[PDB]
Nucleic acid binder design. Structure first.
Ligand SMILES: [K+]
Ligand SMILES: [Mg+2]
Ligand SMILES: [Mg+2]
Lengths: 70, 169, 103, 292, 159
RNA sequence: AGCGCCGUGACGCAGUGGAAGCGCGCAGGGCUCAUAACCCUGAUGUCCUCGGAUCGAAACCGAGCGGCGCUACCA
RNA sequence: GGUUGCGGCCAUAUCUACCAGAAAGCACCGUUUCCCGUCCGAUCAACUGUAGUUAAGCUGGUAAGAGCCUGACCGAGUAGUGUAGUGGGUGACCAUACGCGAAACUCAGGUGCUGCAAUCU
RNA sequence: GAGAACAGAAAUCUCCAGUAGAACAAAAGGGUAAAAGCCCCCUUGAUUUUGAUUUUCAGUGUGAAUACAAACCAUGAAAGU
RNA sequence: AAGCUCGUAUCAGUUUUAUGAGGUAAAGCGAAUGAUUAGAGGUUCCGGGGUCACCUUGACCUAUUCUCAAACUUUAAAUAUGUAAGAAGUCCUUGUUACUUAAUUGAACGUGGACAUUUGAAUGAAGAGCUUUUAGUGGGCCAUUUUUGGUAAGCA
């Protein structure tokens, strides 16, 4: 927070500091991201993650996210 | 399985890619003409590479396509200098197979000067009865996946017919 | 503005000078150069051949320091390629080069 | 392989019959489009289509809702007129063109006039508009994707229709017996092709040559004891019968439409409901991931 | 310098529609135009013959002349302080019938039918269209539909 | 600030959209006791870079780099 | 209901993988004396419809399939925008009043319909 | 992509995939896949007589273009162009 | 300015109904074309410096991920914009023609007959149409909104 406060002085005009309610750089809230790791709907990637959906090839949805359907 | 699903050669293409045009081209044309029993077709260079000493439309190559028992008996002769022995390569994923031999004028036919010596690429194309559906003008279609030619099927037929061997490079 | 111009005639080699306002138009010739292969030179009058076998026995052999050197380099052979400049209904040989490849 | 999603999304599918490879819409536009100052005059097409074992001839005009057939003639009904063999030869093409011509003229009421070419001589001759009378029925040949070639059976149908009475514009360029060096049509050779002479002379030539090939071909002729010399009169009688009675008697049609429906319905695979699809998905989840 | 050619500024309106390129369907060529028909001009970009000028894209006019492959369309064009009669020769690719004039002709037939019935029974059939009238009274029953709603909602960040 | 021109072998420079040349310089042998001169023979180049158009660019186009320049007047 | 000929709208029709196809039709298919066309009867020409096969085409099904189509008070009356004020704000911009109003997103369904003519266990 | 003596990253040949990602003299934009591209066979409609029309517009000229008419032709089996 | 032909209309800087046309605003980039941040997993007969079929700068592919466009775009407003809402109409017979049809088929124009006062939305209409002839003018500037160049300007 204070590092971003120092970065603020380098920009013209007004800037706010906002605490996000999203887990990291994901678009999901923290309780729903917790609900998704307790299930098998989140698989790690480079720095981001991939999500499991009801749509697409079924056998693809088992080869990815293997520990779900258990 | 089904006797209408057996393999057969549908064409064999004899190719000579000469460096230039002129006396060498005309000799190669006479070689291909006599060997095929048909008049061959010449091929012009697509673009000027000029590192091979070629220019556009120069007529640098000569080739001919033969079908039927003609191609059966030329292929029969052409495998002799290979002693009925090809490689695990020389077979394509699409089922077609080919080889090139550096003097076939001297395989079975007469040599004489003013014609010189040459090497020919033999390229065989395999298919099954029903390949008309991808050549005919009306209601042109595509071969079904179970009907396609594959490298393993071509190898199996090439081993059993003409009692040959592969993979022995 | 005005432009003072000094130039050499491409045929007679004479200096010509002229001057004109910078925004009026002057004529520029449609000067073109052509490759020819040097056949016989008999009474002067170099006989030349185009990229085809069609012949130009029409151009006087140069009588200057380039022309005599051309004749000397021609007597022993070593087939030459002569350039002809052909602006405004006049033609003249201006250069000559030894063929590079295909000895 | 493995076409991309963006490829599938941006792909423009051709017209359905172009994908089926059955219609040349470039040729069709010129065949079908009418002079606007002839506002509601239909442009009639003599559609000739050649499949294996059959010949199809149709007089077709166009509407917005689809093409409408004025009259149609098929090769396979020729046994009523006396042709039970060679149902696809050039002579059969002539006979089916004559059948569709006479049938069309009978339907439109143009039989009292416009008899066409009564005596066949193979002479390049259109149907002339009679003096002080209605014009002949005018159709344009529609050969489809057939290649244009001197001696094609589709031009045999064109000849048969024109000699049968319909006015169809054409040239003797593509008829057999047309020499290439000179612009001259041979009526003797064209007559032989019209009356099946080439097949006939093939029969004597092949039989004199050998027996193993001629045994297998022309088995029906041997079965009915038909000589090659006997083709001229039977084709002549076929034309006579066609000109006598083109009335188009259909089949008696045993096993009525409803019975045909009940016969072919009960063996036809039908679409599964969404509930069945869901139950398949659920069971496949249990099968493919239920710890084997 | 400036550029004001015939097809200038027509980059997007002479496009074909997305996934709608290629040949024209035959119903364009099977449509019959008579003199007096009212048509809409919309250029098909794949046919460069008989193409209307960019001005007449979207204009509606009356057919005055019918030729082999084209119609003559009369358009009123505002030039200065008056309308000038403009006569266009357009292939039928760039031309479609005015559907509004199709419902007008159907309404004329319907009006004749209403008057024909009223001439026998039910006089004063009142042909003319009327604008949307104000609503009449009604009784909105509450039984099973008890009103229930809350107030405005507090502000939340949602970021 | 605006505009124009130039860049090629070690050096100075030519150069016709079909792979580059003159003069020296350099190299090998010879002659001389030796070097030079002399004689007989060879070799030396993304043509400033990086892309583009062309079948093919040293040349044409777009940028980038390094030099040379020109205008700079009425107040 | 199936199939064929010609089609209309031109993916709900397309694409990827697999399975199934009574009867008829279509197709593959056999041959080169004839007309015709090729480097090559492979395409096209002609002959037989006979010698054979549904292997392929074709038609349907299967797929938490791709695409495509339709809908939703799903997002969202959000973004945008017309009109109005001696509205607010230093301003960028913003609200309100009288009006119009998306696209992504999410979810849900669907995956050709049909005209004329002939034929069919 | 997979293959074929020399042949290799680039010479010719073959198959599969390939909505155009090519080509269409020349800027750029639009248009086009049994074609408007490529190859082949014919040809001169790049003709005669005028009028009408569109764009720039004064509703003048010039340039360019569109659709007919009356002839004579080209091409094709023909519709047609 | 002079009027002329007529006397409520062949109308309208407007709305409604119906029907078109458009590619801006916005949006989009795990959709095309360009631009662009970061990793992950596979592909070295695609060159990896490494020892006998490898983690170890690359390039390619695939699924993702951050950010964009006056001369990009699937989608796509608001405002503005075309046309129609009838008597010069509609329907029924049967007349003309050298055009058109296979045709006694159409096309266009008609004779005769039928449609009644809501003659086919709303509001208004101050008279409606038409013609001749001639003046001055042909430096503009300001404001809200949209908008280009410019650091900007009481700038252009
Ligand atoms: K625009
Ligand atoms: Mg033109
Ligand atoms: Mg003034």
């Amino acid at each position: 927070v204070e590092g971003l406060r120092r970065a603020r002085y380098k920009f013209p005009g007004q800037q706010k500091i906002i605490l996000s309610k999203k887990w990291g750089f994901t678009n999901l809230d923290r309780p729903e991201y917790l609900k998704k790791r307790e299930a098998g709907e989140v698989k790690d990637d480079g720095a981001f993650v991939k999500f499991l959906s009801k749509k697409g090839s079924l056998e693809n949805n088992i080869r990815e996210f293997p520990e779900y359907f258990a | 399985q089904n006797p209408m699903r057996d393999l057969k050669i549908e064409k064999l293409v004899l190719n000579i890619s000469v460096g230039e045009s002129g006396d060498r081209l005309t000799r190669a044309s006479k070689v291909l003409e006599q060997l095929s029993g048909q008049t061959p077709v010449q091929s012009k260079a697509r673009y000027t590479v000029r590192t091979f000493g070629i220019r556009r439309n120069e007529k640098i190559a000569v080739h001919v396509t033969v079908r039927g028992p003609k191609a059966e008996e030329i292929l029969e002769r052409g495998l002799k200098v290979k002693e009925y022995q090809l490689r695990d390569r020389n077979f394509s994923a699409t089922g077609n197979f080919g080889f090139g031999i550096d003097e076939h004028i001297d395989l079975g036919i007469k040599y004489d000067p003013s014609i010189g010596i040459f090497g020919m690429d033999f390229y065989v194309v395999m298919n099954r009865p029903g390949a008309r559906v991808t050549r005919r003008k009306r209601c042109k279609g595509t071969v079904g996946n179970s009907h396609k030619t594959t490298k393993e099927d071509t190898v199996s037929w090439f081993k059993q017919k003409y009692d040959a061997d592969v993979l022995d490079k | 503005a005005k432009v003072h111009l000094v130039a050499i005639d491409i045929f007679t080699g004479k200096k010509l000078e002229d001057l004109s306002p910078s925004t009026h138009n002057m004529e520029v010739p449609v000067v073109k150069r052509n490759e020819y292969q040097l056949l016989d030179i008999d009474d002067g009058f170099l006989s030349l051949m185009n990229m085809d076998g069609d012949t130009k026995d029409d151009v006087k052999a140069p009588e200057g320091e380039l022309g005599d050197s051309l004749q000397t380099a021609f007597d022993e052979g070593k087939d030459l390629m002569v350039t002809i400049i052909s602006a405004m209904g006049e033609e003249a040989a201006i250069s000559f080069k030894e063929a590079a490849r295909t000895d | 392989d493995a076409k991309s999603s963006a490829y599938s999304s941006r792909f423009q599918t051709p017209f359905r019959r172009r994908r089926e490879g059955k219609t040349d819409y470039y040729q069709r536009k010129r065949l079908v489009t009418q002079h606007k100052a002839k506002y509601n005059t239909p442009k009639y097409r003599l559609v000739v289509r050649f499949t294996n074992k059959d010949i199809i001839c149709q007089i077709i005009s166009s509407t917005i809702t689809g093409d409408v057939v004025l009259a149609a003639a098929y090769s396979h009904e020729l046994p009523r007129y006396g042709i039970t063999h060679g149902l696809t030869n050039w002579a059969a093409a002539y006979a089916t063109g004559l059948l569709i011509a006479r049938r069309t003229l009978q339907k439109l009421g143009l039989d009292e006039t416009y008899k066409g070419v009564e005596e066949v001589e193979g002479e390049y001759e259109l149907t002339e508009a009679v003096e002080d009378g209605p014009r002949p029925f005018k159709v344009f040949l529609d050969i489809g994707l057939q290649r244009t070639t001197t001696g094609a059976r589709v031009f045999g149908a064109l000849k048969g229709a024109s000699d049968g009475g319909l006015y169809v514009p054409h040239s003797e360029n593509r008829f057999p017996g047309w020499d290439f060096e000179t612009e001259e049509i041979d009526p003797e050779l064209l007559r032989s092709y019209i009356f099946g002479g080439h097949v006939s002379q093939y029969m004597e030539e092949l039989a004199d040559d050998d027996e193993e090939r001629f045994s297998e071909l022309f088995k029906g002729y041997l079965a009915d004891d038909i000589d090659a010399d006997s083709l001229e009169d039977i084709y002549t009688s076929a034309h006579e019968a066609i000109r006598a009675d083109p009335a188009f008697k259909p089949t008696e049609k045993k096993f009525t439409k409803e019975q045909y429906a009940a016969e072919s319905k009960k063996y036809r695979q039908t679409k599964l409901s969404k509930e069945e699809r869901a139950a398949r998905v659920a069971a496949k989840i249990a099968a493919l991931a239920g710890q084997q | 310098g400036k550029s004001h050619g015939y097809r200038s500024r027509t980059r997007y309106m002479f496009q074909r529609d997305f996934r709608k390129h290629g040949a024209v369907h035959l119903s364009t060529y099977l449509k019959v135009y008579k003199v007096g028909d009212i048509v809409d001009i919309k250029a098909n970009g794949s046919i460069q013959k008989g193409m209307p000028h960019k001005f007449y894209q979207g204009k509606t006019g009356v057919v005055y002349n019918v030729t082999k492959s084209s119609v003559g369309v009369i358009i009123n064009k505002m030039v200065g302080n008056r309308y000038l009669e403009k006569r266009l020769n357009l292939r039928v690719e760039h031309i479609k019938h005015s559907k509004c004039r199709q419902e007008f002709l159907e309404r004329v037939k319907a009006n004749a039918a209403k008057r024909a019935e009223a001439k026998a029974q039910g006089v004063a059939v009142q042909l003319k269209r009327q604008p949307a009238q104000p609503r009449e009274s009604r009784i909105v029953s509450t039984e099973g539909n008890v009103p229930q709603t809350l107030a405005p909602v507090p502000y939340e960040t949602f970021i």
